[PDB]
């Protein structure tokens, strides 16, 4: 789809290592296979937000900030602004705090020319308690607000098809499958592999 | 209560300013009235996590990291560990992602001798959609897991009474009232005032 991001090889690296040397080194080993990297709080809190600009300059990659933004609207605005100022191309935001909290993020993203990904569901066991039951309504909330980028789980394929039905065929969907999602997110299988390149290149072979 | 934190004057400063100079300056202006300061992501992402240790050293204050932790268990562990290593005395965690996500935080806090605050509810308008309906069950989940520190909203007094009933009389409850909560959180009324010290001192006079 032209109006949503192009992710090289439909493979997003979840760079969840917490030290700068390893994150930069392991990312380097697989740089030829991916142009989009997802980073989260453990890395940025440990090493500083300046690491975002570092990735983009050293590897030329898009950065998705997996910050699971989940505050009140005013605070969400400030988190998004700081994150985009640091160079992030996109930010992942929770839907459970409701529509105004999501809209706050969309406002800043539109202002600054960046993207919001709405996290519709999670797949860790505790997600059954509240998240699973809210997933469909959160996805619909996103659609109603004009959200064009979504994160959904891959552990249950039939959940991905359901998400697709809600968000439509054109919105961008990434999942941690490619019949429904536009790109897959892979972390450990790559960054822990004794040969990250052998892991990455292999995954792209199947894709 | 002896086994939960003593907050000076029952007043927590929500230091939500985003630049280091102002945050340190305005905090300095009201330093004698508070020993517990809540810091969030806008400040820490803008200025670095090193600012946490700076607050504790310059003001001798306790720091609560209002990071609204809301990830999977493994990632929650790492966020908590990084935050505690940076010197935070406590961290605020969402309950919506469920019990294992909360327990991950509790594990690290117990290891490192720090505290987890469970956020049971929020008071912005959008909170009605999903958070309001989950609040009682989240508070009960906290109790069942041995959580001793909670954050609840104050805009609805009768919600604080309900929360207090669930968590019992001894757990520590903070809220943005003092008949139910152990301490109140104040931000803008203090840090955005021609004379923050006048605001802080005044608030403390009402508390008796």
Describe the model:
- The PDB classes it as lyase.
- Keywords: orotidine 5'-monophosphate decarboxylase, mutant V182A, lyase.
- The assembly is dimeric.
- The entry is titled "Crystal structure of the mutant V182A of orotidine 5'-monophosphate decarboxylase from Methanobacterium thermoautotrophicum".
- Chains A, B: Orotidine 5'-phosphate decarboxylase.
- 2 copies of one chain form a homodimer.
- Chain A has 207 residues and is an alpha/beta fold.
- Chain A has one domain (1-207): Aldolase class I (TIM Barrel, Alpha-Beta Barrel).
- Helix content of chain A is 45%, strand content 18%.
- Chain A has helices at 20-29, 41-47, 50-59, 73-85, 99-112, 131-144, 157-167, 188-191, 196-206; strands at 11-14, 36-40, 62-69, 90-94, 115-119, 149-151, 172-175, 183-186.
- Chain A has an 8-stranded parallel beta barrel with strand order 1-2-3-4-5-6-7-8, surrounded by 5 helices.
- In chain A, helix 6 runs parallel beside helix 7 (157-167).
- The radius of gyration of chain A is 16 Å and the shape is globular.
- In chain A, 53% of the residues are buried.
Quickly describe the structure:
The structure is a homodimer. Chain A is of the alpha/beta class. Chain A has helices at residues 20-29, 41-47, 50-59, 73-85, 99-112, 131-144, 157-167, 188-191, 196-206, and strands spanning 11-14, 36-40, 62-69, 90-94, 115-119, 149-151, 172-175, 183-186.
